[model samples]
Target: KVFGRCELAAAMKRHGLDNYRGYSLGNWVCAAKFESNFNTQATNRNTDGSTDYGILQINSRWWCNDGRTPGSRNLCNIPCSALLSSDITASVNCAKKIVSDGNGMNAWVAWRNRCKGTDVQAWIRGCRL
Candidate 1:
């Protein structure tokens, strides 16, 4: 599923990502923009040979089991393919686990370099959520 900016924002909020661990909904919106362009099926293979899956680009190196990550920890205990589903429920839950693990949104380097410490509210201003 390819989502518009506001659509993704509302979806993330519905999943309780808004202000989850102090990272605002805008932060998630901005990060998703740069991470996967709001495409639920987006996939990026990293230089480490791990692949990032779905909208939030959850990685196979630690959080998901891709069955090809060379001993992936699978801390989220979900198949990497689960994140690629349009439903996004697994993706959102795994992302919350990532945040709860103490990495916060910094788990995403793009979020750190782009969305972090910025006026991310612009990403969700007119959504009325």
Candidate 2:
């Protein structure tokens, strides 16, 4: 289900990401599992025009101003959907940076408490790494 490996690599490079492959894949899998169970097409409605979308369910409106506009270059600025366009590795890594700076464990903890209302430590068992 990976979209663009090269694009992801390029994104990682563009972001100055170190350990891009490991950080990207690991964090993506963990976050997707915690967020929407790895549903790539997932979307949720907000009270306002804002909406949460994709595997990590990014709140585009709140996180990125260009969310309403499709294909807008907002990866480093806003929550760009392009980042999540098949290359789950890139999508997950992007979200990780926003969540806990590539700390998959910490991100899982936050996801469990903030999103799932579960014990942070308990969620660790679910993550592959």
Candidate 3:
């Protein structure tokens, strides 16, 4: 599913992403914007041959196990393919684990470069919180 901006916001909020790890809904939305354009099926292969999966682009190197990454830790304890589902539950849960692991939202390079310390309200201005 390619979620609309507010649509994605609501979905994440429903899945307990709002204010998670002190990062607001806008932060999540903004990161997803730059990371995968809110598309659930998005994937990016890194130079190390590890792949990022789904809307939030969780990585296989340390998060999910694709059975392809050289030494995946599977910290999220899920198949990497689970992150690609349109439902987004596994993706959101795995992201929560990432944040709770002390990475905060900084685990996502897009969040650090584009959403971090910025006025993120504009990312969700028109949304009904």
Candidate 4:
């Protein structure tokens, strides 16, 4: 909410995520772009029977509660719908917390499968962050 795709680098810095685990703002932006294209309300059902939520598409399997179904972790104790809001505060916090849990950004399939080894710099191109 604080930043559009065009300003994601600035937003990352503002949110204290410009260099999480050396993943870089560009890496984060690339993942966010692929995950939900910056839309706060995006959702997708996975074959694993879990639902993804919000711009980063944090999963209902662990990050937050999906009231329509059962879950495993809801570590953020947030309703799945809350991730759909424009406020990225809670979602951002949850995401950073996710990194500390285990496989780091590899926890986000979008990042591992898509944004991991390519030209991620374009994600923040000309942003001057």
Whole-model lDDT values for every prediction: 0.89, 0.49, 0.90, 0.81
RMSD of each: 1.1, 7.8, 1.0, 2.0
TM-scores for every predicted model: 0.95, 0.47, 0.95, 0.87
Tens digit of lDDT per residue, candidate 1, span 8-48?
A: 88888898889888888989999989899889999988788
**After superposition, candidate 3 runs with Cα above 4 Å error:** none
In model 3, residue pairs whose N, Cα or C atoms come closer than 3 Å (at least 3 residues apart or on different chains), thus clashing, are: none
Residues 7-69, candidate 2: write the lDDT tens digits.
Answer: 333443455443443443333334455566655666676666665666667665434444364
Q: Identify the candidate with maximal TM-score.
A: 3
Against the true structure, candidate 4 reaches a TM-score of: 0.87
Q: In candidate 2, what residue range of length 10 has the lowest lDDT sum?
A: 120-129
Q: What TM value does model 2 have?
A: 0.47
User: Which is better, 1 or 3, measured by lDDT?
Assistant: 3
lDDT of 4 by residue, 96-126 (tens): 8888768468888889999988998888887
lDDT accuracy of residue 62 in candidate 4: 81
lDDT of 3 at 118: 89
Show where candidate 4 strays beyond 4 Å: 1-3
